[PDB]
Design a protein around this ligand. Structure first.
Ligand SMILES: [Ca+2]
Ligand SMILES: [Ca+2]
Ligand SMILES: [Ca+2]
Ligand SMILES: [Ca+2]
Ligand SMILES: [Zn+2]
Length: 316
């Protein structure tokens, strides 16, 4: 929409108040002109027709409970845009400042959030398993990270390359959570998952087996459910990323941690320079070793820790 850039105020899903970039033309629209070619948030109105209507508001105030999921989708898209720009010098998901579009209120009682190849889509959850999915910055950054992958490595969403594609999104969603720095951790979706239970989540990176996911290659899932286990087998790579960052001893193999910033640098470089559509786990290991070598040199602690972490999860 053509009009002027303004600043609105509203409340997110978890009741936190925040400023949002809007655009004024008769109404105030959730259209942020300050980042690339814009961030646009739409109302799907409990239907599944996409994108729906660009979110319009009469007074630039977004405090109705109906407003909350749009507030968070809009604001966290902006945090993720800044993470990639300031940390990786990447401008939007295509690297050319493509518009980031998101729809909330998708369908009824929909317990999921996804990138559909063109935009982000969030369900409201059923109030029991999930509250509105855009309330979790790690969920927002997870799904936007799939857009990043699609424009770079283009890892096919099946078997091993698929589990890599899932792991990358868990890794960068966690790193965005740490970057924004509000109660960060190594679990996925804790903020929006089961309002009745403390400390649970969808998945754990520090301990995948907590929720039934393999933490070692010898335990990979080899059936056909979940596109050959893209959500299950991601646990092996998640645990490797956790060990590279934090360090630890895992099945008797010791790893010196190098911190989150270097983990991000190494995996961002592997993603954008070395992985291809069909990459398997062992090729992920080579790409990450070559990444660490370009960045830190072949004799470095960083390279040594990458090899140790992949050793610990059984990936040679
Ligand atoms: Ca209003
Ligand atoms: Ca958290
Ligand atoms: Ca988290
Ligand atoms: Ca919970
Ligand atoms: Zn995913």
């Amino acid at each position: 929409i053509t009009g002027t850039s303004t600043v609105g105020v509203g409340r997110g899903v978890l009741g936190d108040q925040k400023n949002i970039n809007t655009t004024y033309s008769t109404y105030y629209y959730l259209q942020d002109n300050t980042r690339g070619d814009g961030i646009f948030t739409y109302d799907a109105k409990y239907r599944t027709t996409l994108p729906g209507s660009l979110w319009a508001d009469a007074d630039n105030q977004f405090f109705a409970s109906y407003d909350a999921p749009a507030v968070d989708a809009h604001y966290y898209a902006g945090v993720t845009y800044d993470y990639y720009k300031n940390v990786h010098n990447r401008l939007s998901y295509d690297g050319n400042n493509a518009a980031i579009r998101s729809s909330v209120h998708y369908s009824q009682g929909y317990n999921n959030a996804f990138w559909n190849g063109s935009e982000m889509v969030y369900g409201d959850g059923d109030g029991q398993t999930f509250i509105p999915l855009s309330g979790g910055i790690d969920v927002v950054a997870h799904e936007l990270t799939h857009a990043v992958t699609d424009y770079t490595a283009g890892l096919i969403y099946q078997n091993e390359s698929g589990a890599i594609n899932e792991a990358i999104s868990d890794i960068f969603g966690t790193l965005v959570e740490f970057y924004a720095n509000k109660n960060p951790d190594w679990e996925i979706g804790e903020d929006v998952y089961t309002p009745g239970i403390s400390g649970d989540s969808l998945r754990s990176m520090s301990d995948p087996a907590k929720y039934g996911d393999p933490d070692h290659y010898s335990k990979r899932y080899t059936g056909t459910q979940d596109n050959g286990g893209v959500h299950i087998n991601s646990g092996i790579i998640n645990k490797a990323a956790y060990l590279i960052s934090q360090g630890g001893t895992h099945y008797g193999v010791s790893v010196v941690g190098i911190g989150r910033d270097k983990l991000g640098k190494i995996f961002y470089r592997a993603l954008t320079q070395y992985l291809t559509p069909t990459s398997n786990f062992s090729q992920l290991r080579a790409a990450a070793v070559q990444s660490a070598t370009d960045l830190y040199g072949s004799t470095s602690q960083e390279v040594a820790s990458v090899k140790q972490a992949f050793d610990a999860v059984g990936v040679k």
